[PDB]
Amino acid sequence: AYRPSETLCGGELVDTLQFVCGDRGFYFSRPASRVSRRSRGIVEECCFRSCDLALLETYCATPAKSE
């Protein structure tokens, strides 16, 4: 089986987020916030480059919000 994208921009990206961050919350695209947490991530990275689960998992929503 061969697919044109090893990294399905959109599909694999948002599904992996929703998969393990369904409960935690998933948002790698942040326009703004009064917390100044407006930093988008992984979108262009994991679209064109190969990524590891660590990146997306430790990103998820906010890195220290389960604490």
Partner: protein
């Protein structure tokens, strides 16, 4: 007959001659189990599920990622009916890795709320999903 094991989802127990047929649980529609809040997993026993790309035995229904091709390699390992699926889709966690669903059937003669694919855990690094299923169909009466 040669081997109590068969690549037909049916295994005979060498201790009491109990023939476990898991084809009785087979199906094309399969069974739907809830995983992530906004996601369900499609799973068909010994067959392929039609809700996901042809050949798929296990698949999450959000984007339709395959976590196991519809194989039928059932193994009987110490009262445990193992139905292992492999050759899924490349696991995004590690580029080039593949998903795998391990179906583990356990004897539950009293039946109950355990007669449903119970996700034990997902081995995070190896993209291996473990599934429990407690049913009296998978039991040999001692």
């Amino acid at each position: 007959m040669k081997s109590n094991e068969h690549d037909d989802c049916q295994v005979t127990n060498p201790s009491t001659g109990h023939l476990f047929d898991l084809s009785s649980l087979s199906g094309r529609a399969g069974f739907t189990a809830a995983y992530s809040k906004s996601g369900v997993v499609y799973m068909s026993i010994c067959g392929e599920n039609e809700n996901c790309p042809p050949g798929v035995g296990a698949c999450f229904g959000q984007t339709r990622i395959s976590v196991g091709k519809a194989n039928k390699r059932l193994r009987y390992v110490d009262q445990v009916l193992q139905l292992v699926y492999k050759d899924g889709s490349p696991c995004p966690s590690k580029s080039g890795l593949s998903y795998k669903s391990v179906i583990s059937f356990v004897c539950r003669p009293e039946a109950g709320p355990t007669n449903r694919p119970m996700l034990i855990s997902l081995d995070k690094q190896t993209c291996t999903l473990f599934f429990s299923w407690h049913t009296p169909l998978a039991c040999e009466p001692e």
